[PDB]
A paper describes a structure:
ArdK is a 102 amino acid protein encoded by the broad host range conjugative plasmid R388. The KorA family of transcriptional regulators includes plasmid-borne repressors involved in plasmid stability and conjugation. Our structural analyses show that ArdK, a member of this family, can form a symmetric dimer similar to that observed for KorA, yet it binds direct sequence repeats as a non-symmetric dimer.
ArdK was crystallized as described in the Materials and Methods, and resolved to 3.0 Å resolution. In the crystal of the apo structure, there is a single ArdK molecule in the asymmetric unit. This molecule contains an N-terminal HTH domain (residues 1–62) and a C-terminal domain with a C-terminal α-helix (residues 75–102) connected by a linker region (residues 63–74). Thus, the biological assembly is very probably a dimer containing two HTH domains (α1–α4) and a dimerization domain (DD, β1 and α5). Comparison between both structures revealed that both dimers are symmetrical, but the orientation of the HTH differs: in ArdK, the HTH domains are rotated 150° with respect to their position in KorA.
Author numbering:
A (entry chain A), B (entry chain A): 13 to 106
Write the structure that this text describes.
C-alpha cells in the first residue's frame, strides 16, 4: 500500500479480501499463473516494511537458543530503519 | 506412538484423524479443556523424536542469516541421538 500500479492493487485485493483461489483469477483476466503469484507477493512484503529478498523460516529448538533467534530478527529490523533515513538526508543538499 | 496409556491414544486419535474440535470431545468424555490439550501435545512431540520442553519459532530475515538458523536445528537434533545411546550402554554392566 504505497507506490504501485493500479492493476497490482486490483488483482491482489480480490484474493486476500473475499477469498478466491489464484487459479480461477488467471483465466478471467487472461494472465499466466507465474505472474499473478508475483503480484500478491509484493503487497504482503510492503505491509511488513521489509525488502523483497528476505525469506521465511520455521523450526523446533531448545529454550535458550529459542530466545537468541527471537532477538536476531528484532535488531536486524531496526537497522534498515536507521540506515535508510541517513541516505535521504545526504540527497537534500548539505 | 510408543509407551503411553491406552486412553491417551484413543482420545488423541479422534481429533488428528477424522477432524473434530477439541471442545466437543471434552463434554462427551467428561474432561477439562486443559487436559485434552495436554494429551494431544505428547503424541505430536513423540512423532518428531524430541523432548517435550522444546518450543516452535517462526520469523523473517535476510538470506545469509537464514542459512545459519537452518543449521543450528540440524546439529542440535543429532546431538541428542549420540548422547542417548551412550547412557544406555553404561547401564548394561561393563
Amino acid at each position: 500500500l504505497g507506490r504501485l500500479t493500479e492493476e497490482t492493487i486490483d488483482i491482489a485485493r480480490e484474493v486476500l479480501v473475499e477469498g478466491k483461489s489464484q487459479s480461477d483469477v488467471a483465466r478471467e483476466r487472461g494472465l499466466s499463473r507465474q505472474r499473478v503469484s508475483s503480484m500478491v507477493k509484493s503487497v504482503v512484503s510492503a505491509a511488513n516494511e521489509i525488502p523483497r529478498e528476505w525469506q521465511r523460516v520455521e523450526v523446533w529448538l531448545p529454550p535458550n537458543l529459542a530466545e537468541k533467534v527471537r532477538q536476531m530478527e528484532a535488531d536486524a529490523k531496526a537497522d534498515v530503519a536507521r540506515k535508510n533515513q541517513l541516505t535521504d538526508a545526504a540527497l537534500e543538499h548539505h
